[PDB]
Design an enzyme around this catalytic site. Structure first.
Site, short mmCIF file in Angstrom:
data_model
loop_
_atom_site.label_atom_id
_atom_site.label_comp_id
_atom_site.label_asym_id
_atom_site.label_seq_id
_atom_site.Cartn_x
_atom_site.Cartn_y
_atom_site.Cartn_z
N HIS A 149 0.81 -1.22 0.00
CA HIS A 149 0.00 0.00 0.00
C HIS A 149 0.84 1.27 0.00
CE1 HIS A 149 -3.94 1.99 1.47
NE2 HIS A 149 -3.07 2.97 1.29
N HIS A 160 1.26 5.37 -2.16
CA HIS A 160 0.70 6.34 -3.11
C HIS A 160 1.84 6.97 -3.89
CE1 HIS A 160 -3.47 6.41 -1.48
NE2 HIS A 160 -2.84 5.89 -0.44
N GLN A 207 -10.28 8.92 -4.69
CA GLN A 207 -9.99 9.68 -3.48
C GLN A 207 -11.10 10.57 -2.93
OE1 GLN A 207 -6.53 10.61 -1.25
NE2 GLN A 207 -8.59 10.29 -0.39
N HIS A 223 -10.00 1.71 0.75
CA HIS A 223 -9.49 2.52 1.86
C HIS A 223 -10.74 2.41 2.75
CE1 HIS A 223 -6.07 4.05 -0.34
NE2 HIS A 223 -5.74 4.80 0.69
N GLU A 267 -10.99 4.46 7.49
CA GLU A 267 -9.76 5.11 7.97
C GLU A 267 -10.23 6.35 8.71
OE1 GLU A 267 -5.46 7.04 6.53
OE2 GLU A 267 -7.06 6.68 5.06
N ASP A 311 2.39 3.25 2.97
CA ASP A 311 1.33 4.19 2.61
C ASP A 311 1.82 5.47 1.92
OD1 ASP A 311 -1.65 5.43 4.46
OD2 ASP A 311 -1.22 5.25 2.33
#
Ligand SMILES: O=C1NC=C[C@H](O)N1
Ligand SMILES: O=C1NC=C[C@H](O)N1
Ligand SMILES: [Fe+3]
Ligand SMILES: [Fe+3]
Lengths: 423, 423
Positions: free
Chosen positions: A58, A60, A153, A211, A214, A310
């Site tokens: 995971h 980005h 997102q 996701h 969170e 992450d």
């Protein structure tokens, strides 16, 4: 033209082992009764630990290396982070994304990571980062197998043309369908977004990585829908629930009921310790909750859980060198997996469990598998973790693709003495 | 050939009363101005208390007498209990179920219980226990009116062919439709399972009894759907919400709002004190919640609530002799219904309120009703509860079906003295 890896230690195994290589694959694995002599075409592990490659389940890569541009996330929260990213997303260019993704990918190669799953924000009509990442995927293939998650997102139902853009991302080649139910405007949009996510994954035969929850909200329970839908479709292996930090705040009775479903569903879980400890607990004063999902309990229940970095120097995290042993170190501390065995077995959280999360079909030190493996200058998982050792050699397809000549420390006492921090 | 019950005390009434019997029914009830002489065909209550039969509104006769087989519920939780039962359910045989159900039924007859509602697990394609229980129902009819609840222990929507099996159970003769919303994989399955449960009850004209919110989760609110659906269908009298232990953990504002609906709906509530105090609060450390539903408040609001034993020596409870005064004793303590009047009125929780919960049409000491009544060697409900007295005589259809010659205790002081624990 390597033919053998000698003097190798293997997790959970006693003694030393020899790994024979042939045509880019592992042909056989044989135990040794003593130390073998080095020779041409033999890579000496020197009684160090040999394991399949580290995995980054995971990260980005579209936002990496952008912390502070145009502004810094002052609150240290997930929510301001998204808002700060939104400002940067508006300034993206093809080459900009490729340059930054590659910078972090090189650090990952140096750190023995040969499998990476990157989320890419697709709440952008231009899909700038996604187009760039698809090229990066092809470019880095000789060293890293990169999976791309189409990550909405700003929501699927809460963003203009969100569902259309998500599907467009899959049509362009994204390997995984993403979602973010707790960020949708309402609980109903959250649940509906998951039905749509699963339908797309089945329509295109893709994996899923949500996701999920969170947020420090004890009422954020989208994970049960993720697990139930997976069980219904019989596709647990292809599904992942990332974060689930809300689980840290659930009452114990609901959690116990939920765990039955989590195990039956067979879905995967990703915890991101470096980022979770930073972004969670931001709305508490004192005491302050840790905010990582129930890793220890998942391991005890046989539920597959693993660790991701992450973010690497971006709106959600100002630090990092993309080092998995560092991620593991933080996770063991915050999750209190500090018993000798728990620490030693910690490598599983950044190797095998992560490979299962990515649904990998060619992973592990076994005959017939590609010769992809790394060598750590340490006696076992505990030692590697304690000393935060570098990757001595990273081998892919039977060839060395990275190597680190260890640092050399000397203290000048009555006589010079080498210090290696071992006992 | 009993013709009269004489010298009887009645709850809430002053003095002694005579109950005349004719053709298996109560022909008339007349007050006495003094003690009446015994005679042939007269059953002397001896100034003891006469009440309609005790009722067991919630028990599991298919699992009774099986604690520890194949293994024990080590955590003492509802969840492990279901898992331990699952192991035993796989080993069920027709005769095994009948033998065990009958053993507990005999204890119930001995304890003056003439009405019993047993749940039977129908999350079993073979429906082994249900077929056995249907025969037991016919066999025990001369002594006990047994209602059978088709209980989908592993869920309706969360178990293979769960809804089909539930309906098959009704087609075979089950009197009540069961459900367990908090055990379904998701909140949505929980709510949907209730719509399906109500539709089946209306399709077959059966009662409903839901294992409702039996969990220490403040977000488990399936009870509001149970009550709302009952109100909508105008069928409150035929509906029961068992347990509702989550209500013990609700905030007060929601509970107040909810109570309006509970009263308007007219549904029944069952609390199971012996089992609830044992299985609830298992996820707390200290302090530890009691976990029984809001019994005291329901009584104050005129909401029908009653007590069941739930389990007798099985995966959810290692003790029991199927004694309702014992169940009541525990409930009064844990619910803090300890005022003199609350204790004295406690008998209602194991007699009249339970009869209403079972929707009984022939119950109570009144002219025209069947001559079904029991005699307790005590002055009133308080006395019976305090001394945990046995049932002196149990009369059904005007005939004695059980009797207990009281124990005789003597202390040898300067002279022998009989001790009866009375003041
Ligand atoms: O929603 C999110 N975006 C980026 C990082 C963090 O994992 N969460
Ligand atoms: O679900 C349940 N089964 C058996 C007993 C307890 O009442 N709960
Ligand atoms: Fe992320
Ligand atoms: Fe029960």
């Amino acid at each position: 033209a390597l033919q053998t890896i000698i003097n190798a230690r293997l997790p959970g195994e006693e003694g030393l082992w020899q790994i024979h290589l042939q045509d880019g694959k592992i042909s056989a694995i044989d135990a040794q009764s003593g130390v073998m002599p080095i020779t041409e075409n033999s890579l000496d592990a020197e009684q160090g630990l040999v394991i399949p490659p580290f995995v980054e389940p995971h990260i980005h890569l579209d936002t990496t290396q952008t912390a502070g541009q145009p502004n810094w996330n002052q609150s240290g929260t997930l929510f301001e982070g998204i808002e700060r990213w939104a400002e940067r997303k508006a300034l993206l260019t093809h080459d900009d994304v490729k340059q930054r993704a590659w910078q972090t990918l090189k650090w990952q190669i140096a750190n023995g990571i040969q499998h990476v799953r990157t989320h890419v924000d697709v709440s952008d009509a231009t899909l700038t980062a996604l187009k760039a990442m698809l090229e990066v995927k092809q470019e880095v293939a000789p060293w890293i197998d990169l999976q791309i998650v189409a990550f909405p997102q700003e929501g699927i139902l809460s963003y203009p043309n969100g569902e259309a853009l998500l599907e467009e991302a899959l049509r362009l080649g994204a390997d995984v369908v993403g979602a973010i139910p707790h960020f949708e405007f309402t609980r109903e949009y959250g649940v509906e977004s998951l039905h749509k996510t699963f339908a797309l994954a089945q329509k295109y035969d893709r994996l899923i990585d949500v996701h999920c929850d969170e947020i420090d909200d004890e009422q954020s329970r989208f994970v049960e829908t993720v697990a139930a839908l997976a069980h219904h479709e019989g596709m647990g292996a292809r599904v992942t629930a990332s974060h689930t930090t809300a689980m840290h705040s659930y009452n114990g009775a609901y959690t116990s009921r939920l765990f039955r479903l989590l195990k039956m569903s067979g879905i995967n879980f990703v915890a991101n310790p470096l980022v979770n400890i930073h972004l969670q607990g931001r709305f508490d004063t004192y005491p302050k909750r840790r905010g990582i999902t129930r890793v220890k309990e998942m391991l005890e229940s046989g539920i597959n859980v693993c660790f991701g970095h992450d973010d690497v120097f971006d709106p959600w995290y100002p630090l990092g060198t993309a080092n998995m042993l560092q991620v593991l170190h933080m996770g063991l501390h915050v999750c209190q997996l500090m018993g000798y065995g728990q620490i030693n077995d910690g490598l599983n959280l950044i190797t095998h469990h992560s490979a299962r999360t990515l649904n990998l079909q060619d992973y592990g030190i076994a005959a017939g598998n590609s010769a992809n493996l790394i060598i750590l200058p340490a006696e076992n998982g505990f030692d590697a973790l304690r000393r935060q050792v570098p990757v001595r050699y990273s081998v892919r397809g039977g060839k060395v693709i990275a190597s680190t000549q260890p640092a050399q420390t000397t203290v000048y006492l009555e006589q010079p003495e080498a210090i290696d921090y071992k006992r």
